[PDB]
Amino acid sequence: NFLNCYMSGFHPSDIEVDLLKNGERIEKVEHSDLSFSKDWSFYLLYYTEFTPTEKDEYACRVNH
Amino acid sequence: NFLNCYMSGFHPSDIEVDLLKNGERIEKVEHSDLSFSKDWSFYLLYYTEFTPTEKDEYACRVNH
Amino acid sequence: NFLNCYMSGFHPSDIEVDLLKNGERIEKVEHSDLSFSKDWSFYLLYYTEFTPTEKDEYACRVNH
Amino acid sequence: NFLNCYMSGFHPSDIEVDLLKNGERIEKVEHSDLSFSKDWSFYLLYYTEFTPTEKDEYACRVNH
Amino acid sequence: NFLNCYMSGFHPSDIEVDLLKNGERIEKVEHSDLSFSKDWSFYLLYYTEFTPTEKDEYACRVNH
Amino acid sequence: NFLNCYMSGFHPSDIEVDLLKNGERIEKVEHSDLSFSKDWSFYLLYYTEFTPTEKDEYACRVNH
Amino acid sequence: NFLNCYMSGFHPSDIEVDLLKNGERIEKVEHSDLSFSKDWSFYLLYYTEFTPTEKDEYACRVNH
Amino acid sequence: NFLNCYMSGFHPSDIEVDLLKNGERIEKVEHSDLSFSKDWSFYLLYYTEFTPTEKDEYACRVNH
Amino acid sequence: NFLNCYMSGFHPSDIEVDLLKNGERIEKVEHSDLSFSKDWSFYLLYYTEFTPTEKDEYACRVNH
Amino acid sequence: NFLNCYMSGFHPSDIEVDLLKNGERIEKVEHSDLSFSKDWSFYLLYYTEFTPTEKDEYACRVNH
Amino acid sequence: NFLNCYMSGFHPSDIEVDLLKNGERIEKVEHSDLSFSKDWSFYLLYYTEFTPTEKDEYACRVNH
Amino acid sequence: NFLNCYMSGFHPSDIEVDLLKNGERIEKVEHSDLSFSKDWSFYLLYYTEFTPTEKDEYACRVNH
């Protein structure tokens, strides 16, 4: 029994990025850009008035 | 029994980034950029008034 | 029985970044950038008024 | 002079079972089943009345 | 002069079972089943009345 | 002069079971099952009445 | 700022002369001539009257 | 700021002369001539009257 | 700030001459000539009257 | 100056006999017969009356 | 100056006999017969009357 | 100056006989027969009357 109550945010999965995986007899390889990401900022605010009012209840029950 | 009550933030998983994994007889390889990320900042605020009011209850029960 | 009540922050997992894993007879390899990240700052604030008011209860019960 | 008087039972010969003999650059190979046999039972009897009356004379002669 | 008077039972010969003999650059090889056999039971009887009356004369002669 | 008067039972011969004989650059090899056999029981009887009456004369002669 | 005031003479660049780079299974390779040059003589004069009167002002300025 | 006021003479650059870089299984390799040059003579004069009158002012300035 | 006022003469750079870099299983390699140069003579004069009158002012200035 | 006055007998030259010279990924090779010759007998006589009468003069002159 | 006055007999030269010279990933090789010769008998006579009468003069002169 | 006055008999030269000279990843090699010769008998006579009458003069002169 798999129960997921709440999931959010950056969660990519099962991603494969490859270049010349089984390359044979290749010549010069230059300026290969395989960068996945640059910056990870969950809260990025400029001159912001951040006032969230949330009453949240997380209740997930597995009865057997 | 797998129960996930709350999950958030940066959590990528099962990611493979490779270059010339089984390369044979390759010539000069230059300027390969495989950087995954640069900066990890959960809270990044500039001139911000950060006033969040949250009443949150995390209650997940597994009854057997 | 796996129960996760609350998970957050930077937690990537199962990530493989490799270059020329089983390379044979390769020539000059120069300027390979495999940096994972630069800076880890959970709270990064500039001229910020940080006033969060949170009443949070973390209650997860496993009854057997 | 090759003389065979009596031959019986399980005697297979000159059998070759192979998979990917000279395989190269294969990413995944999973759940390969090359089992030759499971159980060798010459007499397997359930609720059996086994009463065979046999008189046998194995007489093979090589005269030179 | 080769003379075989009586041969029986389990006697397989000249059998070759192979997988990836000269394999190169294989990323994953999982759950390979090359089991030859499980159980060797010449007499396996359940609730059996085994009463065989046999008179056998194994007489093979090589005269030179 | 090769003379075999009586041969029986479990006697396999000249069998080769192999996996990745000359393997190179393999990342993972898991759960490889090359078991030849499990149990060797010549007489395996359950609730059996074993009463075989046999008179055997094994007489093989090489005359030179 | 790249400024070149005067450049002359023999200055070839970025030249690649190659033969059988990744050659395989070659029976014979004979009399391969890859000579780049023979003689470097800036002044080579025979029975010459060399009388050049030159006034040169090499003035190149980078103002920031 | 790169400033070159005067450059002359023999100055080749970035030259690659190669033969059978990754050669395999070659039976014979004979009389391979990869000579780059033979003689370096800046002034080579035979029965020469060398009388050059030159006034040169090499003045290159980088002002910051 | 890189400033070169005067450069001359024999100054080649970044030159790579190679033969059979990663060679394998070669039966014969004979009479390989990789000579770079033979003779370095800046002034080589035969029956020469060398009378050059030159006034040179090498003045290159870096002002910060 | 090459002078051959008398040449006779078995003298073959420059003969190449090969099988699978640069073979790759070949299966079983069996019963390869590359025998050059069996028997070398210059004089082989059976019940022979061998009576040769020869007056032979071998005179070859190289005058320089 | 090469002068050959008399040459005879078994003198083969420059003969190459090879099997799988640069073989890679070959399977079982069996019963390879590369025998050059069996028997060397210059005089082989059976019930022979060998009576050769020869007056032979070997005179080769190199005058310089 | 090379002068050969008389040459005879068994004199083969420059003969190469090889099997799997640079073999890689080969399986079982069995019953390889590379025998050069068996028996060397210059005079082999059976019931022979050997009566050769030869007056031979070997005179080769090199005059300089």
Swiss-Prot record, chains A, B, C, D, E, F, G, H, I, J, K, L:
Belongs to the beta-2-microglobulin family. Component of the class I major histocompatibility complex (MHC). Involved in the presentation of peptide antigens to the immune system. Exogenously applied M.tuberculosis EsxA or EsxA-EsxB (or EsxA expressed in host) binds B2M and decreases its export to the cell surface (total protein levels do not change), probably leading to defects in class I antigen presentation. GO terms for cellular component: cytosol; early endosome lumen; early endosome membrane; endoplasmic reticulum; endoplasmic reticulum lumen; ER to Golgi transport vesicle membrane; external side of plasma membrane; extracellular exosome. Changing residue 40 to V: Increases tendency towards amyloid formation. This is Beta-2-microglobulin. Glycans are attached at residues 21, 28, 38. The keyword Amino-acid biosynthesis does not apply. It is linked to Immunodeficiency 43: A disorder characterized by marked reduction in serum concentrations of immunoglobulins and albumin, and hypoproteinemia due to hypercatabolism. Patients may suffer from recurrent respiratory tract infections and severe skin disease. Disulfide bonds join 5-60. It comes from the Eukaryota. It comes from Homo sapiens. Keywords: Amyloid, Amyloidosis, Disease variant, Disulfide bond, Glycation, Glycoprotein, Immunity, Immunoglobulin domain, MHC I, Pyrrolidone carboxylic acid, Secreted, Signal. One of its GO terms (biological process) is cellular response to iron(III) ion. It is found in: Secreted; Cell surface. The keyword Glycoprotein applies. GO terms for molecular function: identical protein binding; MHC class II protein complex binding; peptide antigen binding; protein homodimerization activity; structural molecule activity. Residues 1-64 form the Ig-like C1-type domain. Heterodimer of an alpha chain and a beta chain. Beta-2-microglobulin is the beta-chain of major histocompatibility complex class I molecules. Polymers of beta 2-microglobulin can be found in tissues from patients on long-term hemodialysis. B2M alone (not in complex with HLA-I) interacts with M.tuberculosis EsxA (ESAT-6) and an EsxA-EsxB (CFP-10) complex; the tripartite complex can be detected in the host endoplasmic reticulum. The B2M-EsxA complex can be detected in patients with pleural tuberculosis and is stable from pH 4.0 to 8.0 and in the presence of 2M NaCl. Its main location: secreted.
